[PDB]
Design an enzyme around this catalytic site. Structure first.
Site, PDB file in Angstrom:
ATOM      1  N   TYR D  26       0.825  -1.196   0.000  1.00  0.00           N
ATOM      2  CA  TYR D  26       0.000   0.000   0.000  1.00  0.00           C
ATOM      3  C   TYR D  26       0.864   1.253   0.000  1.00  0.00           C
ATOM      4  O   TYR D  26       1.983   1.260   0.520  1.00  0.00           O
ATOM      5  CB  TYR D  26      -0.941   0.021   1.212  1.00  0.00           C
ATOM      6  CG  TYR D  26      -0.275   0.416   2.509  1.00  0.00           C
ATOM      7  CD1 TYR D  26       0.539  -0.476   3.193  1.00  0.00           C
ATOM      8  CD2 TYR D  26      -0.465   1.679   3.052  1.00  0.00           C
ATOM      9  CE1 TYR D  26       1.148  -0.120   4.379  1.00  0.00           C
ATOM     10  CE2 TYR D  26       0.140   2.043   4.237  1.00  0.00           C
ATOM     11  CZ  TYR D  26       0.945   1.141   4.897  1.00  0.00           C
ATOM     12  OH  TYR D  26       1.550   1.499   6.078  1.00  0.00           O
ATOM     13  N   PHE D  36       2.041  10.422   2.758  1.00  0.00           N
ATOM     14  CA  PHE D  36       2.471  10.381   4.147  1.00  0.00           C
ATOM     15  C   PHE D  36       3.058   9.045   4.574  1.00  0.00           C
ATOM     16  O   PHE D  36       3.811   9.009   5.551  1.00  0.00           O
ATOM     17  CB  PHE D  36       1.302  10.733   5.082  1.00  0.00           C
ATOM     18  CG  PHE D  36       0.284   9.636   5.230  1.00  0.00           C
ATOM     19  CD1 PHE D  36      -0.717   9.470   4.288  1.00  0.00           C
ATOM     20  CD2 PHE D  36       0.316   8.783   6.320  1.00  0.00           C
ATOM     21  CE1 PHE D  36      -1.656   8.467   4.422  1.00  0.00           C
ATOM     22  CE2 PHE D  36      -0.620   7.777   6.460  1.00  0.00           C
ATOM     23  CZ  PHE D  36      -1.609   7.620   5.510  1.00  0.00           C
ATOM     24  N   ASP D  37       2.743   7.956   3.877  1.00  0.00           N
ATOM     25  CA  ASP D  37       3.268   6.651   4.250  1.00  0.00           C
ATOM     26  C   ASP D  37       3.166   5.710   3.058  1.00  0.00           C
ATOM     27  O   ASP D  37       2.207   5.779   2.286  1.00  0.00           O
ATOM     28  CB  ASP D  37       2.513   6.070   5.453  1.00  0.00           C
ATOM     29  CG  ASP D  37       2.881   4.627   5.732  1.00  0.00           C
ATOM     30  OD1 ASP D  37       4.079   4.287   5.637  1.00  0.00           O
ATOM     31  OD2 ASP D  37       1.973   3.832   6.051  1.00  0.00           O
ATOM     32  N   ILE D  56      -6.718   0.682  10.689  1.00  0.00           N
ATOM     33  CA  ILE D  56      -7.875   1.564  10.626  1.00  0.00           C
ATOM     34  C   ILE D  56      -9.045   0.827   9.985  1.00  0.00           C
ATOM     35  O   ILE D  56      -8.868  -0.115   9.199  1.00  0.00           O
ATOM     36  CB  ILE D  56      -7.544   2.859   9.865  1.00  0.00           C
ATOM     37  CG1 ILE D  56      -6.719   2.555   8.615  1.00  0.00           C
ATOM     38  CG2 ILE D  56      -6.809   3.835  10.771  1.00  0.00           C
ATOM     39  CD1 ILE D  56      -6.215   3.790   7.902  1.00  0.00           C
ATOM     40  N   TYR D  82      -8.461   7.473  11.532  1.00  0.00           N
ATOM     41  CA  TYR D  82      -7.883   8.105  12.718  1.00  0.00           C
ATOM     42  C   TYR D  82      -8.752   9.213  13.307  1.00  0.00           C
ATOM     43  O   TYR D  82      -8.754   9.418  14.525  1.00  0.00           O
ATOM     44  CB  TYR D  82      -6.497   8.664  12.388  1.00  0.00           C
ATOM     45  CG  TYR D  82      -5.465   7.595  12.120  1.00  0.00           C
ATOM     46  CD1 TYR D  82      -4.916   6.862  13.161  1.00  0.00           C
ATOM     47  CD2 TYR D  82      -5.048   7.314  10.827  1.00  0.00           C
ATOM     48  CE1 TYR D  82      -3.976   5.881  12.924  1.00  0.00           C
ATOM     49  CE2 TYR D  82      -4.107   6.334  10.579  1.00  0.00           C
ATOM     50  CZ  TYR D  82      -3.575   5.621  11.632  1.00  0.00           C
ATOM     51  OH  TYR D  82      -2.638   4.643  11.397  1.00  0.00           O
ATOM     52  N   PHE D  99      -5.636   5.437  -0.322  1.00  0.00           N
ATOM     53  CA  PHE D  99      -4.679   4.338  -0.277  1.00  0.00           C
ATOM     54  C   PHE D  99      -4.638   3.648  -1.633  1.00  0.00           C
ATOM     55  O   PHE D  99      -5.682   3.260  -2.167  1.00  0.00           O
ATOM     56  CB  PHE D  99      -5.046   3.336   0.819  1.00  0.00           C
ATOM     57  CG  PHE D  99      -4.752   3.820   2.209  1.00  0.00           C
ATOM     58  CD1 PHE D  99      -3.460   3.793   2.707  1.00  0.00           C
ATOM     59  CD2 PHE D  99      -5.767   4.299   3.019  1.00  0.00           C
ATOM     60  CE1 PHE D  99      -3.187   4.236   3.987  1.00  0.00           C
ATOM     61  CE2 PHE D  99      -5.500   4.744   4.299  1.00  0.00           C
ATOM     62  CZ  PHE D  99      -4.209   4.713   4.783  1.00  0.00           C
TER      63      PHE D  99
END
Lengths: 310, 738, 145, 107
Positions: D26, D36-37, D56, D82, D99
């Site tokens: 992902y 961000f990730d 999540i 979140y 995502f």
């Protein structure tokens, strides 16, 4: 049979402690003079204006450390070890055969050993460390007084001249203030602690005779340094110890010495009064009497050195 | 834009360098939460790419290397560095198989010491416990761990880059990586040293590093010159000094471990020999005069006294005085000679062949070539030279921190070490609630460990009490009241484990008394002197004077803390008086006897300050003992802690202390005019009628209504009265009736 | 005295908005005098630990005077000197001070001394202040602007 | 909610079931274009289980309706992820997530 039938780890620990206390503690280590000899050789396989041999760099580093302004002197183990090394490079090597040749050769050898490092600023280093100690006793100043004694052993005129010139050039009060404080912190013959120590010895205390004086070695070192400051009838340094013209305040170290002598005399008189009743003084009383009389002799010698050379 | 475009843009380069500095500073000193958060900004791939980027500017390269270190390895390296100072070698079979690795090693001819830092070691060091970074996991802090990076790939990459830099530095290229030799060598040397302290490099990797540093000496028995033979600036020389310091520490640790390994075998042999000797003494030796000199002088002494004299075989060659066979002495002397040879004090233009000679020559050459200006490099060089020249002293200093344990306690001592490391890591964090809870939990887990009370010498060697006292100094010098209670409870329990622990803790009595419900530093001070005649005799007069002054101050002025809660307002506080009098009862009464000097001095200080006796026994206008007790009783049944009980408790404690300070009977019967003087002072302080009246107070005893013990009269108060009566007054014929 | 002079001079927001009360001749020198006062304030405490400790009581005033567009160049130096010399004012810094510093960074452009000030905020003389670290992380990092 | 789309088709008949380990690759990003990730930069896949969420809610719901390699673009709105508490140094409080996931699980 308490030795065996025990866990092997406990016996191993006990053997480690005993072995460390009995065998590893070798005396010579044959390294004090060799280090100073190796550090005194400059320009090996190479080469004035450039800073000479590593010994002078080390002395300059310690002088810089002492010169940094702060409210307390930190305990530097490296300085302690290296100062002990320099002190033993001269004192431990040169602290019936009364021939002129042998005696003079010993004197020249000692002079060369002291010149090996007093020309590199050790005289300034000792004074700076003593001033920076701020009159607080400890192992920081014990290793400095001994080094100063080793450098000044025999009454070196050059070292005395360098120290006096540095003191008269800086004109900074605080060296004699620290000296006075250190003298004021010197202990005397204590009778109150004597009975407590006698009771403790009659059932550990982790030591023997560590509460009566416990710092007579430090007192002897301090007074030996003070005496060696003016050993060779140094009139200028004998005058400096009384009145400091350049400084804004005078401490009169001579009066401090006589005050400590009076205190020690009172302590000795009290000890004699305590031991008057008994017919035979036991071993522990004699040890304390001798350890006080040695300090009294050192103080008396320091007082004589203030007068000789009229 | 491209990050390499910052070479000519000097305005953005400064901002980015300071941004990286901010990134490192925000997550500095074990802030693993921010370290985890920063992985979203500076990912692993970016750090790995910047590690190998040969065109990056010098400041950016150094900043990225330091950022990677401070993000992924800083806390774990700090913990390992803290643990490296103490050696705890278990008696595992591989420890037994560990030899000295001397000049006369397995393959050798008494000449080669081997290579430092490579071999087998058994000193116990806890693992690192990294955690993987993930920003998609569900939100739930129980000691968040550092982000995880592949350490094997990182180590291999660092080795490859260091080798490439070493190879490229010999060609004198005009475009060094980062624009300078320092920017090419320092960032990678720091990473290599950090991973070396981390214990990531293997044996082959250690050999490769040694060959790269100096291939002439560190090889196994104009051609790939090592790092030490190049012309490096001072910044690289500092990193080289750190790298060599690591190897010196490894050599010292190996020496300690080998000494313990030999100690195991020697202990086994000595035990067997002594068992055989005792068997011979028992079965045989029935014709002499019981051999009392050869028995009571050897087998009756304590085991510590049975091992010190047993080691007097050699070093005098004329005073054996021990039942040690010659072959055993020869074996121990051979080991001693091997140890002396290892320490470089052997032998009763050639290139160096050992680590000590190489380091000494390199330091002397560095100091001779140029006048070193940076103080840090000078200090490091001279410290390294001093360590190399004097190795026996280094071993002597490192020995007291060495301990040997059985392999059956490794699992428990690992947990104890982990808790201690948690305490040490928390010691560098500003005080807070989460930190307080974590440190309290770690202290409790240390308490519950079975190792804590089984090896007090090991606890003292680790300096655990010093760490906990530093924690108390930090918190005290109010905030976080629970923490000081936990600390004082730990210290109180530590004091009672052994006599040596109490003696060691006694050295801080001045600080403990100066800073004077749950545990208190006063409780620690009392527990550090309780039931210790030698410690009680060594107690200083000023220590008692401070407690006397505190007692006078508390007696004269009431504490407003009790006034804050619902309670009547009075000018004298009994609770503080009782608490201060509790400590004094242990410094004058030990093992049922009484110390003369301490009792005399405390009596003198107490009588010179009459305010310590309370508002009843002060002087003019005093109500008296009976009136004070009756007034407290009357207060006990009206609203007017529960006041009224403490009023009598303070007087009972004071009278108990006064009775305990009374001179012994044989002191009185054998002259000692000072004893009768003290007895007369105590006599005139309080009359017999007061005591007789005090013992004569009545007591109070659906179901029967029993009064509360904490809010009514209690015969424990009368116990002090009876003790005082016995110890000064006594009874012969008069009081024996009424 | 310097604080009072700065307060009196900084009552007026600009050199033209109600700053000509002394006349049009003194309008141009007002900024120069303000800058000189700020520089003297910075120099009087630069490197002196006791002076910085005594001046730490004016932390709120120093932070508030950071958005004047003419006094920032000196007030930032004063704040940096106070934080460096006396690392005890760190504990008494709330979130509003950090937010004001970040706002100064956002409004006055990308300055490399604001980052130094934040670094001084983050860590004390050997003890990590986790509150400041977390506040800076929460107030600066998530917004990649 | 979840607004799963399709990037590369999968099989359509091997949906994950209860009590199974789902292995995904992902790449996360906000609704601004700012990533961000990601998991591919770490050179390791991400494994998680159904009923033991540890992720999540939106990610789990998006990964539920996949079939052995179906690349999808999931849009996790607030009160599904979140949420208002956000993440320090990571997604701001009120922000939705996108995502780019690929279910390469090999069971």
């Amino acid at each position: 049979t308490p030795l065996y039938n025990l866990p092997t780890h406990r016996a191993c620990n006990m053997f480690l402690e005993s072995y460390k206390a009995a065998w590893i503690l070798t005396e010579d280590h044959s390294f004090e003079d060799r280090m100073i000899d190796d550090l005194s050789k400059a320009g090996e396989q190479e080469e004035e204006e450039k800073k000479p041999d590593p010994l002078h760099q080390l002395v300059l580093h310690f002088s810089r450390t002492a010169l940094t302004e702060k409210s307390k002197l930190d305990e530097d183990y490296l300085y302690m070890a290296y100062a002990d090394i320099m002190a033993k490079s001269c004192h431990l090597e040169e602290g019936v055969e009364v021939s002129f040749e042998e005696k003079e050769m010993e004197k020249q050898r000692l002079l060369y050993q002291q010149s090996r490092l007093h020309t590199r600023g050790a005289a300034e280093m000792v004074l700076q460390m003593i001033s920076a100690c701020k009159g607080e006793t400890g192992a920081m100043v014990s290793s400095t007084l001994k080094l100063g004694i080793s450098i000044l052993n025999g009454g070196n005129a050059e070292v005395q001249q360098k120290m006096l010139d540095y003191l008269k050039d800086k004109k900074e009060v605080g060296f004699f203030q620290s000296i006075q404080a250190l003298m004021q912190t010197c202990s005397v013959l204590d009778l109150n602690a004597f009975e407590r120590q006698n009771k403790a010895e009659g059932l550990i205390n982790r030591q023997n005779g560590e509460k009566v004086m416990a710092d007579d070695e430090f007192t002897q070192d301090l007074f030996r340094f003070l005496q060696l400051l003016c050993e060779g009838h140094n009139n200028d340094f004998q005058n400096y110890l009384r009145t400091q013209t350049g400084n804004t305040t005078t401490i009169n170290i001579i009066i401090c010495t006589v005050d400590y002598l009076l205190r020690l005399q009172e302590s000795i008189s009290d000890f004699y009064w305590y031991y008057s009743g008994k017919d035979v003084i036991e071993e522990q009383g004699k040890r304390n009497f001798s350890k006080a009389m040695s300090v009294a002799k050192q103080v008396f010698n320091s007082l004589t050195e203030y007068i000789q050379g009229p | 834009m491209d990050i390499l475009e910052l070479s000519e843009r000097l305005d953005l380069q400064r901002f980015h360098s300071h941004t990286l500095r901010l990134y490192r500073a925000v997550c500095a000193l074990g802030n693993n939460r921010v370290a985890h958060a920063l992985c979203s900004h500076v990912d692993q791939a970016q750090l790995l790419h910047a590690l190998e980027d040969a065109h990056l500017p010098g400041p950016l390269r150094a900043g990225y290397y330091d950022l990677l270190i401070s993000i992924h390895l800083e806390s774990a390296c700090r913990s390992r560095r803290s643990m490296l100072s103490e050696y705890i070698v278990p008696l595992t079979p591989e420890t037994r198989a560990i030899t000295l690795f001397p000049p006369g090693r397995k393959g050798g001819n008494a000449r080669r010491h081997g290579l430092p830092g490579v071999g087998v070691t058994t000193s116990l060091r806890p693992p690192h416990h990294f955690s993987p970074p993930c920003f998609v996991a569900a939100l739930p802090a129980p000691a968040r761990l550092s982000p995880a990076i592949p350490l094997e790939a990182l180590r291999d990459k660092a080795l490859r880059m260091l080798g490439e830099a070493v190879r490229d530095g010999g060609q004198h290229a005009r475009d060094p990586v980062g624009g300078s030799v320092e920017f090419q060598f320092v960032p990678v040397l720091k990473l290599v040293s950090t991973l070396l302290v981390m214990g990531i490099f293997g044996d082959e990797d250690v050999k490769q590093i040694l060959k790269m540093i100096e291939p002439e000496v560190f090889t196994e028995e104009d051609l790939e010159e090592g790092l030490l033979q190049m012309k490096l600036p001072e910044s690289v020389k500092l990193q080289m000094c750190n790298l060599l310091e690591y190897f010196c520490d490894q050599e010292l640790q190996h020496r300690v471990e080998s000494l313990a390994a030999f100690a195991e075998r020697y202990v086994d042999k000595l035990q067997a020999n002594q068992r055989s000797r005792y068997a011979l003494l028992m079965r045989a030796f029935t014709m002499s005069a019981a051999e009392t000199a050869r028995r009571t002088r050897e087998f009756r002494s304590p085991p510590q006294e049975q091992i010190n004299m047993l080691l007097h075989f050699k070093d005098e060659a004329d005073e054996e005085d021990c039942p040690l066979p010659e072959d055993i002495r020869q074996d121990l002397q051979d080991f001693h000679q091997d140890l002396l040879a290892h320490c470089g004090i052997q032998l009763e233009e050639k290139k160096p062949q050992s680590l000590q000679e190489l380091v000494s020559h390199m330091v002397v050459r560095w100091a001779q070539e140029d006048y070193v200006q940076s103080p840090e490099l000078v200090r490091a060089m001279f410290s390294l030279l001093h360590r190399q020249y004097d190795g026996l002293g280094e071993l002597l200093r490192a020995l007291p921190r060495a301990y040997t344990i059985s392999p059956s306690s490794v699992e428990d001592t690992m947990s104890l070490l982990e808790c201690l490391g948690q305490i040490r890591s928390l010691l560098i964090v500003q005080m807070g609630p989460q930190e307080e809870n974590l440190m309290i939990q770690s202290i409790g887990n240390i308490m519950n460990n079975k190792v804590f009370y089984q090896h007090p010498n090991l606890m003292r060697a680790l300096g655990m009490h010093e760490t906990v006292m530093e924690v108390m100094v930090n918190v005290l010098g109010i905030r976080f009241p629970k923490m000081v209670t936990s600390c004082c409870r730990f210290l109180c329990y530590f004091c009672r484990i052994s006599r040596q622990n109490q003696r060691s803790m006694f050295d801080h009595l001045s600080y403990l008394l100066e800073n004077s419900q749950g545990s208190t530093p006063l409780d620690v001070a009392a527990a550090s002197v309780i039931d210790n005649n030698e410690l009680a005799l060594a107690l200083q007069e000023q220590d008692l004077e401070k407690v006397v002054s505190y007692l006078a101050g508390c007696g004269l002025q009431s504490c407003p803390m009790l006034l804050a809660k619902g309670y009547p307002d009075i000018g004298w506080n009994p609770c503080g008086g009782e608490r201060y009098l509790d400590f004094l009862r242990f410094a004058v009464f030990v093992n049922g006897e009484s110390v003369e000097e301490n009792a005399n001095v405390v009596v003198r200080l107490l009588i010179r300050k009459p305010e310590c006796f309370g508002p009843a026994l002060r002087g003019e206008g005093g109500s008296g003992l009976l009136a004070a007790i009756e007034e407290a009783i009357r207060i006990s049944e009206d609203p007017a802690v529960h006041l009224g009980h403490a009023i009598m408790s303070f007087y009972a404690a004071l009278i108990d202390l006064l009775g305990r300070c009374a001179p012994e009977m044989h002191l009185i019967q054998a002259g000692k005019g000072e004893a009768l003087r003290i007895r007369a002072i105590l006599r005139s302080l309080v009359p017999l009628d007061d005591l007789v009246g005090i013992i004569s107070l009545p007591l109070q005893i659906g179901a029967l209504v029993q009064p509360k013990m904490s809010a009514s009269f209690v015969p424990d108060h009368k116990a002090s009265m009876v003790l005082f009566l016995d110890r000064v007054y006594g009874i012969e014929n008069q009081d024996f009736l009424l | 005295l310097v604080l009072n002079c700065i307060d009196r001079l900084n009552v007026y927001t600009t050199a033209a908005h109600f700053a000509e009360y002394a006349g049009e001749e003194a309008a141009e020198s007002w900024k120069e005098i303000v800058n000189l006062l700020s520089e003297l304030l910075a120099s009087l405490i630069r490197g002196n630990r006791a002076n910085c400790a005594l001046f730490s009581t004016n932390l709120d005033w120093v932070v508030s005077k950071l958005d004047r567009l003419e006094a920032s160049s000196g007030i930032l130096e004063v704040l940096y000197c106070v934080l460096i010399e006396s690392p005890e004012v760190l504990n008494i810094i709330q979130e509003n001070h950090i937010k004001s510093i970040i706002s100064l960074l956002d409004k006055h452009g990308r300055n490399h001394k604001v980052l130094d000030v934040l670094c001084s905020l983050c860590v004390c003389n050997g003890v990590a202040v986790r509150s400041n670290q977390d506040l800076i992380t929460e107030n600066l990092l998530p917004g990649r602007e | 909610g979840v607004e799963i789309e399709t990037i590369s088709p999968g099989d359509g008949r091997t949906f994950p079931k209860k009590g199974q380990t789902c292995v995904v690759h992902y790449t996360g990003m906000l609704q601004n274009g700012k990533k961000f990730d990601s998991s591919r930069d770490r050179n390791k896949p991400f494994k998680f289980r159904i009923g033991k969420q540890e992720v999540i809610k939106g990610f789990e719901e998006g990964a539920a309706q996949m079939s052995l390699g179906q690349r999808a673009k999931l849009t996790c709105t607030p009160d599904v992820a979140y949420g208002a508490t956000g993440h320090p140094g990571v997604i701001p409080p009120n922000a939705t997530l996108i995502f780019d996931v690929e279910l390469l699980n090999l069971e």
